[PDB]
Design a protein around this nucleic acid. Structure first.
Ligand SMILES: Cn1cnc2nc(N)[nH]c(=O)c21
Length: 231
DNA sequence: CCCGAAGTCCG
DNA sequence: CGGACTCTCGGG
């Protein structure tokens, strides 16, 4: 069975605007885990828009099919476009899509794709269905996959006043001993971001619980100005 | 326009 | 370790 024609059209149009000179630094920035065509986001978005204008967005029955097919293409721009396309189907994504989203997190994994899946798509699902958190988060923390561990940390990133503080700190406690940069940094990020809503709670947590040095420093990068740096 | 959110390079 | 800095991207 051939590639979906929308994907074939997108592949043709992206490839015709590839930039091998830019592709080399773009691939190096992702530590050469991926081939790149060399197309940056403003142009990539317009090229996708060109294809939607010509072909129309596929019927929602094909949404997951399109995403998978783009995920399986070698160049990283096709995963970025896949995430752009998934946003166009946002109103059709619900709690039944958590396994589909998990599979995207653990395939072609790196911070660029995972961070575009977790605080937005999964974050919105678990805000609406917080009773489903315990069906996934414990497994993610226990898994060998650092990107599911990062998902457990960052899905609440944007929750602000809806943050479940007890849950957040329990998750961080489970992962505070990790030597993985992407876990230590995710802990620092979510704490730094939540400190924009509740600085006192974050300050108390980082002063009284063990964290990797990187995590602590990133957490208080801004709020240390409010409290001071004791001699 | 601005600001705040991986990477290199150095001590 | 962490400071100083780069570029790209999203949002105000
Ligand atoms: C702070 N920060 C986090 N991710 C970032 N990505 C880029 N490209 N540039 C930054 O300054 C940056």
């Amino acid at each position: 069975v051939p590639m979906h024609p929308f994907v074939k059209a997108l592949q043709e149009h992206f490839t015709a605007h590839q930039n091998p000179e830019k592709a080399e630094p773009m691939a190096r920035y992702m530590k050469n885990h991926f081939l790149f065509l060399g197309i940056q986001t403003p142009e990539r978005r317009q090229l996708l828009k060109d294809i939607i204008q010509i072909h129309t967005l596929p019927d929602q029955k094909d949404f997951q099919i399109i995403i998978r097919e783009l995920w399986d293409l070698p160049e990283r721009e096709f995963q970025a476009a896949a995430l752009d396309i998934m946003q166009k189907y946002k109103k059709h994504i619900n709690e039944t899509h958590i396994p589909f989203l998990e599979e995207l997190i653990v395939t072609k994994s790196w911070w660029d794709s995972v961070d575009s899946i977790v605080p937005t798509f999964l974050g919105d699902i678990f805000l609406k269905h917080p009773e489903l958190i315990s069906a996934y988060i414990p497994k993610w923390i226990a898994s060998d996959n650092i990107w599911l561990q990062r998902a457990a940390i960052l899905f609440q990133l944007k929750y602000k006043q809806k943050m479940d503080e007890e849950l957040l700190f329990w998750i961080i406690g489970q992962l505070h001993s990790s030597k993985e940069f992407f876990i230590q940094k995710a802990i620092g990020w979510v704490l730094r971001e939540y400190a924009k809503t509740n600085p006192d709670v974050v300050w108390e947590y980082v002063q009284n619980n063990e964290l990797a040095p990187l995590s602590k420093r990133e957490a208080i990068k801004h709020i240390k100005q409010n409290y001071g740096i004791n001699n």
